Short mmCIF file of C-alpha atoms in Angstrom, two decimals:
data_model
loop_
_atom_site.label_atom_id
_atom_site.label_comp_id
_atom_site.label_asym_id
_atom_site.label_seq_id
_atom_site.Cartn_x
_atom_site.Cartn_y
_atom_site.Cartn_z
CA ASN B 1 -17.85 18.52 14.93
CA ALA B 2 -19.47 15.50 13.44
CA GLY B 3 -17.68 15.55 10.43
CA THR B 4 -20.19 18.32 8.92
CA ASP B 5 -17.07 20.70 8.92
CA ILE B 6 -15.30 18.80 5.93
CA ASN B 7 -16.12 18.34 3.13
CA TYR B 8 -13.84 15.27 2.60
CA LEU B 9 -10.57 13.45 4.00
CA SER B 10 -7.79 11.31 1.81
CA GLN B 11 -4.87 9.80 1.75
CA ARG B 12 -2.65 11.58 -1.87
CA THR B 13 0.51 10.15 -3.43
CA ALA B 14 2.91 12.70 -5.69
CA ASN B 15 1.03 12.25 -9.32
CA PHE B 16 -1.92 14.11 -7.35
CA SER B 17 -3.56 10.81 -7.05
CA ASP B 18 -5.98 10.87 -5.09
CA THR B 19 -6.74 6.51 -3.13
CA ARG B 20 -9.33 6.84 -1.08
CA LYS B 21 -10.79 10.36 -1.39
CA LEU B 22 -14.03 9.91 1.20
CA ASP B 23 -17.22 12.09 2.35
CA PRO B 24 -16.51 11.81 5.62
CA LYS B 25 -20.01 9.77 6.46
CA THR B 26 -17.85 7.33 3.57
CA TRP B 27 -14.59 7.51 5.36
CA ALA B 28 -16.32 6.73 8.98
CA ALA B 29 -17.64 3.53 6.68
CA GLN B 30 -14.58 2.04 6.26
CA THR B 31 -13.90 2.71 10.88
CA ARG B 32 -16.80 0.72 11.55
CA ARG B 33 -15.59 -1.68 9.15
CA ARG B 34 -12.46 -1.57 11.68
CA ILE B 35 -13.36 -0.83 15.54
CA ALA B 36 -16.81 -1.89 15.56
CA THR B 37 -18.29 1.33 16.24
CA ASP B 38 -17.71 5.25 15.41
CA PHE B 39 -14.38 7.01 17.04
CA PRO B 40 -15.05 10.62 19.05
CA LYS B 41 -16.18 13.14 17.11
CA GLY B 42 -13.68 14.91 14.95
CA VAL B 43 -11.03 11.58 14.98
CA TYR B 44 -10.76 9.94 11.96
CA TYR B 45 -8.38 6.44 11.16
CA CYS B 46 -7.19 5.50 8.26
CA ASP B 47 -5.26 0.98 8.29
CA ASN B 48 -2.95 1.10 6.81
CA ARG B 49 -2.01 -1.66 7.61
CA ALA H 1 -15.56 -54.02 16.91
CA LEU H 2 -16.60 -55.75 19.79
CA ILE H 3 -18.70 -58.49 18.65
CA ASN H 4 -21.01 -60.34 21.52
CA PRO H 5 -21.43 -64.20 21.30
CA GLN H 6 -25.18 -64.06 22.07
CA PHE H 7 -25.75 -61.53 21.42
CA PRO H 8 -24.02 -60.97 17.87
CA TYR H 9 -23.79 -58.32 15.68
CA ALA H 10 -25.81 -58.17 12.20
CA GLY H 11 -23.88 -60.32 10.29
CA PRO H 12 -24.66 -56.71 7.58
CA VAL H 13 -27.43 -53.95 7.00
CA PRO H 14 -28.91 -55.95 5.34
CA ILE H 15 -32.19 -55.83 2.71
CA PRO H 16 -34.89 -54.48 4.37
CA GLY H 17 -32.80 -50.73 3.55
CA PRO H 18 -35.33 -48.32 2.23
CA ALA H 19 -33.84 -46.57 -1.27
CA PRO H 20 -34.69 -43.06 -0.19
CA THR H 21 -35.04 -40.79 -4.68
CA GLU H 22 -32.81 -41.69 -7.69
CA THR H 23 -31.24 -38.61 -7.41
CA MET H 24 -27.80 -39.60 -7.89
CA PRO H 25 -26.72 -38.35 -11.07
CA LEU H 26 -24.40 -34.31 -11.66
CA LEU H 27 -25.37 -33.39 -14.89
CA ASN H 28 -22.84 -32.33 -16.24
CA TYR H 29 -22.07 -28.94 -17.00
CA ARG H 30 -21.42 -28.20 -21.03
CA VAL H 31 -20.09 -24.00 -21.14
CA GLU H 32 -18.56 -21.13 -23.41
CA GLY H 33 -16.56 -18.53 -22.25
CA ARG H 34 -15.30 -15.02 -23.50
CA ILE H 35 -13.24 -12.49 -21.49
CA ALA H 36 -13.24 -10.05 -24.67
CA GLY H 37 -12.49 -6.62 -23.99
CA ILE H 38 -10.14 -4.18 -25.73
CA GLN H 39 -7.30 -3.52 -23.56
CA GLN H 40 -5.22 -0.54 -24.31
CA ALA H 41 -1.74 -0.74 -22.98
CA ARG H 42 -1.16 2.21 -20.51
CA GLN H 43 -2.12 2.59 -16.73
CA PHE H 44 -1.30 5.94 -15.25
CA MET H 45 0.58 5.68 -11.19
CA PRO H 46 1.86 7.42 -9.31
CA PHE H 47 5.03 5.96 -9.07
CA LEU H 48 7.03 3.04 -10.46
CA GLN H 49 9.58 2.29 -10.85
CA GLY H 50 11.89 5.29 -8.67
CA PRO H 51 15.08 5.52 -6.40
CA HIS H 52 14.25 8.09 -4.71
CA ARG H 53 17.05 10.25 -2.81
CA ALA H 54 17.05 9.28 0.96
CA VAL H 55 19.89 12.42 0.75
CA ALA H 56 21.85 14.32 -1.56
CA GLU H 57 24.81 15.36 -1.15
CA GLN H 58 25.88 18.24 -1.17
CA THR H 59 26.56 19.46 -5.34
CA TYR H 60 28.59 22.78 -7.27
CA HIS H 61 29.85 24.60 -9.56
CA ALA H 62 33.00 26.77 -10.02
CA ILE H 63 34.66 29.99 -10.93
CA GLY H 64 37.19 31.51 -10.55
CA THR H 65 39.24 35.61 -11.78
CA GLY H 66 40.93 38.19 -11.42
CA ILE H 67 44.60 39.19 -11.87
CA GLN H 68 48.17 39.45 -9.77
CA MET H 69 48.65 41.94 -8.57
CA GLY H 70 49.51 44.39 -5.07
CA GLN H 71 50.32 47.35 -2.23
CA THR H 72 54.12 46.15 -1.00
CA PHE H 73 56.66 47.46 2.40
CA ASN H 74 60.03 45.47 2.45
CA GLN H 75 62.43 45.06 6.10
CA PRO H 76 65.78 47.02 5.98
CA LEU H 77 69.02 46.43 5.10
CA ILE H 78 70.79 45.20 8.28
CA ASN H 79 74.65 44.83 9.39
CA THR H 80 75.65 41.26 7.51
CA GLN H 81 77.41 39.69 10.07
CA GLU H 82 79.87 36.81 9.51
CA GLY H 83 80.49 35.15 6.35
#
């Protein structure tokens, strides 16, 4: 599914502190800045280069 | 540069030039800048300053206890050879 089955995604460290807790469309927005489009349905990407 | 006689390169850009403007002025900037918000002494992190263990050693505590007790069976007597 295209994000509709997810509330949010995030990267979290040992203190419960989220560095990027985002709703699916906003998460996808960050990816669009990286590959100029979206990955296929249900595929989520995170850049930590 | 090459100059060629008799067609010589004018000896200057001369006095017929069109002064187009007097807009030459950069007005000096005068300003007062204040960055003064209350600062609170602390920031929260997940972890700072820790040098986490990649493997620990094996560790242990110790105990013993008891007494000295025993049930025994002995070899029989034998004829002594020599001496």
